[PDB]
Design an enzyme around this catalytic site. Structure first.
Site, PDB file in Angstrom:
ATOM      1  N   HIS A  49      -2.171   2.408  -3.312  1.00  0.00           N
ATOM      2  CA  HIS A  49      -3.359   3.071  -3.894  1.00  0.00           C
ATOM      3  C   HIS A  49      -4.577   2.980  -2.911  1.00  0.00           C
ATOM      4  O   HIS A  49      -4.677   2.128  -2.082  1.00  0.00           O
ATOM      5  CB  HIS A  49      -3.757   2.431  -5.232  1.00  0.00           C
ATOM      6  CG  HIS A  49      -2.886   2.788  -6.421  1.00  0.00           C
ATOM      7  ND1 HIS A  49      -2.832   2.014  -7.551  1.00  0.00           N
ATOM      8  CD2 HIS A  49      -2.108   3.865  -6.657  1.00  0.00           C
ATOM      9  CE1 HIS A  49      -2.048   2.606  -8.450  1.00  0.00           C
ATOM     10  NE2 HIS A  49      -1.610   3.740  -7.935  1.00  0.00           N
ATOM     11  N   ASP A 101      -7.742   1.928  -3.069  1.00  0.00           N
ATOM     12  CA  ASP A 101      -8.508   0.701  -2.942  1.00  0.00           C
ATOM     13  C   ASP A 101      -7.926  -0.200  -1.905  1.00  0.00           C
ATOM     14  O   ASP A 101      -8.645  -0.981  -1.285  1.00  0.00           O
ATOM     15  CB  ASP A 101      -8.772  -0.029  -4.253  1.00  0.00           C
ATOM     16  CG  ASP A 101      -7.514  -0.464  -4.997  1.00  0.00           C
ATOM     17  OD1 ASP A 101      -6.461   0.182  -4.902  1.00  0.00           O
ATOM     18  OD2 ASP A 101      -7.627  -1.439  -5.783  1.00  0.00           O
ATOM     19  N   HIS A 154       1.681  -3.436 -11.858  1.00  0.00           N
ATOM     20  CA  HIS A 154       0.613  -2.469 -11.721  1.00  0.00           C
ATOM     21  C   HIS A 154       1.085  -1.209 -11.041  1.00  0.00           C
ATOM     22  O   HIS A 154       0.698  -0.105 -11.404  1.00  0.00           O
ATOM     23  CB  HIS A 154      -0.552  -3.115 -10.979  1.00  0.00           C
ATOM     24  CG  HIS A 154      -1.550  -2.151 -10.488  1.00  0.00           C
ATOM     25  ND1 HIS A 154      -2.444  -1.487 -11.304  1.00  0.00           N
ATOM     26  CD2 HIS A 154      -1.763  -1.694  -9.247  1.00  0.00           C
ATOM     27  CE1 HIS A 154      -3.194  -0.688 -10.551  1.00  0.00           C
ATOM     28  NE2 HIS A 154      -2.800  -0.787  -9.261  1.00  0.00           N
TER      29      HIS A 154
HETATM   30  O1  LIG Z   1      -6.381  -0.991 -11.703  1.00  0.00           O
HETATM   31  C1  LIG Z   1      -6.305  -0.959 -10.431  1.00  0.00           C
HETATM   32  O2  LIG Z   1      -6.198  -2.027  -9.801  1.00  0.00           O
HETATM   33  C2  LIG Z   1      -6.114   0.270  -9.629  1.00  0.00           C
HETATM   34  S1  LIG Z   1      -5.922   0.227  -7.883  1.00  0.00           S
HETATM   35  C3  LIG Z   1      -6.091   1.450 -10.326  1.00  0.00           C
HETATM   36  C4  LIG Z   1      -5.932   2.820  -9.827  1.00  0.00           C
HETATM   37  C5  LIG Z   1      -4.793   3.558 -10.173  1.00  0.00           C
HETATM   38  C6  LIG Z   1      -4.544   4.784  -9.607  1.00  0.00           C
HETATM   39  C7  LIG Z   1      -5.436   5.317  -8.721  1.00  0.00           C
HETATM   40  C8  LIG Z   1      -6.601   4.635  -8.403  1.00  0.00           C
HETATM   41  C9  LIG Z   1      -6.880   3.381  -8.949  1.00  0.00           C
HETATM   42  C10 LIG Z   1      -8.188   2.672  -8.604  1.00  0.00           C
HETATM   43  C11 LIG Z   1      -9.062   2.266  -9.794  1.00  0.00           C
HETATM   44  C12 LIG Z   1      -9.534   3.222 -10.688  1.00  0.00           C
HETATM   45  C13 LIG Z   1     -10.313   2.877 -11.760  1.00  0.00           C
HETATM   46  C14 LIG Z   1     -10.663   1.527 -11.997  1.00  0.00           C
HETATM   47  C15 LIG Z   1     -11.476   1.121 -13.085  1.00  0.00           C
HETATM   48  C16 LIG Z   1     -11.782  -0.200 -13.275  1.00  0.00           C
HETATM   49  C17 LIG Z   1     -11.316  -1.169 -12.393  1.00  0.00           C
HETATM   50  C18 LIG Z   1     -10.546  -0.817 -11.316  1.00  0.00           C
HETATM   51  C19 LIG Z   1     -10.181   0.542 -11.100  1.00  0.00           C
HETATM   52  C20 LIG Z   1      -9.375   0.953 -10.009  1.00  0.00           C
HETATM   53 ZN   LIG Z   2      -3.599   0.169  -7.678  1.00  0.00          ZN
HETATM   54 ZN   LIG Z   3      -6.723  -1.952  -7.647  1.00  0.00          ZN
END
Ligand SMILES: O=C(O)/C(S)=C/c1ccccc1Cc1ccc2ccccc2c1
Ligand SMILES: [Zn+2]
Ligand SMILES: [Zn+2]
Length: 219
Positions: A80, A82, A141
């Protein structure tokens, strides 16, 4: 109190866990995220990059100036944004981007440049005197998420497999395996029975209790 150093505007902050281990936190799109900075005798090693290339460049530049050594290696813990959004920067700078084969396959599928695909289910790496173990505990996840363990400190980087105390739900589960996630957490708890600190992918550092919190969120 732990030393906390920030960039202009607070989009990047580093917080010291011990003499050679820091947590790096960036604000993406606001959504904070964490990784690690390991200050080793042979260079800096990061656990995870950041949301995009602009933030990854600024993180690298901050830590190279502060610690007076180059970033040599990054461990990417799933595919992903992040975690992997700075991969172009890593590759063009000659920074080694380690990952499992599955993470690399997913990165490619999703249009990112590919990390190395060198990590196995258990991989033991050494950077200077800093020992790092990577572990694939199973799906959670994401299909591919790994954890990183520092055995000289009993510090676990849970990544996005592990939710912080402030997370009250599982978040984005589009790519998640909510049945296997509990077993994967249990695999971490079985492997690492004595844990000093746990760094979640998002939110405050905690301890083993974050693993128990994640289990409760999965009920
Ligand atoms: O939960 C994750 O660890 C991830 S990397 C999710 C994710 C899932 C798919 C695409 C992008 C993301 C990033 C994301 C998007 C929204 C968020 C809101 C609150 C807290 C964290 C968040 C993270
Ligand atoms: Zn993720
Ligand atoms: Zn994340």
């Amino acid at each position: 109190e732990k030393t906390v150093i920030k960039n202009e505007t607070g989009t990047i902050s580093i917080s010291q866990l011990n003499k050679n281990v820091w947590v790096h936190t960036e604000l993406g799109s606001a959504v904070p995220s964490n990784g690690l900075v390991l200050n080793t005798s042979k260079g800096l090693v990061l656990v995870d990059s950041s949301w995009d290339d602009k933030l990854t460049k600024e993180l690298i530049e901050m830590v190279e100036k502060k610690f007076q050594k180059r970033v040599t290696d990054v461990i990417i813990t799933h595919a992903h944004a992040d975690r992997i959004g700075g991969i172009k920067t890593l590759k063009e700078r000659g920074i080694k981007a380690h990952s499992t084969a599955l993470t690399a396959e997913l990165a490619k599928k999703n249009g990112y440049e590919e990390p190395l695909g060198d990590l196995q289910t258990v991989t033991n790496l050494k950077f200077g005197n800093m020992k790092v173990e990577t572990f694939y505990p199973g799906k959670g996840h994401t299909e591919d998420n790994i954890v990183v363990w520092l055995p000289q400190y009993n510090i676990l980087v849970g990544g996005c497999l592990v939710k912080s105390t402030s997370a009250k739900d599982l978040g984005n589960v589009a790519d998640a395996y909510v049945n296997e996630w509990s077993t994967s957490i249990e695999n971490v708890l079985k492997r690492y029975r004595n844990i000093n600190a746990v760094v979640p992918g998002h939110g405050e550092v905690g301890d083993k209790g974050l693993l128990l919190h994640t289990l409760d969120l999965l009920k």
